[PDB]
Design a binder for this molecule. Sequence first.
Ligand code: CA
Ligand code: CA
Ligand code: CA
Ligand code: CA
Lengths: 148, 28, 28
Amino acid sequence: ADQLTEEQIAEFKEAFSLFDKDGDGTITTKELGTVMRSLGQNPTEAELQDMINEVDADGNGTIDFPEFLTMMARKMKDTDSEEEIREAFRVFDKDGNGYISAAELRHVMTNLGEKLTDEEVDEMIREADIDGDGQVNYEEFVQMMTAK
Amino acid sequence: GSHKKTDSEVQLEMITAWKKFVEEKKKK
Amino acid sequence: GSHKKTDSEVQLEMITAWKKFVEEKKKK
Ligand SMILES: [Ca+2]
Ligand SMILES: [Ca+2]
Ligand SMILES: [Ca+2]
Ligand SMILES: [Ca+2]
């Protein structure tokens, strides 16, 4: 990898626009609510605040273009948080080689106290596994959470 | 009887998961 | 030590709830 191309930009642009049907360019708690409502579920507004606000750098609730693409790629209420993701990978792993294996996921989870089968993890890997080698690298992790 | 995953649905279910983790802890 | 919770903890909370959607949706 020694050259960038605008394919990434266009992809992220559309993925945002999908949720922001309004046009103004914010993913607020009302925006979240309306989507679930149309389908056929009625959320509790308190939870809609929290689930955003953990990550949101401002802690304002109105998640613009850059603040959404933060929540997708960078993540956490920090600045250049690609490093914080690279660090999160190393906690989860017992090596850290720009990847996260299915076994490593089972370990770090079950460590708390959760005897659950691996296949349930694997379903939500090969929902959107680009590389196809039973792991989850940086690009695959983001793109799976930002599926377009 | 799922034929193929739709990209939009994966995001929405992953957003439903965000709601779930908070709900489970804060259940008082 | 520790008091406030970092990214790692929030990510454990998510990943558990994420596995929960697979159970809710796709477990007959
Ligand atoms: Ca709006
Ligand atoms: Ca913002
Ligand atoms: Ca790995
Ligand atoms: Ca892989």
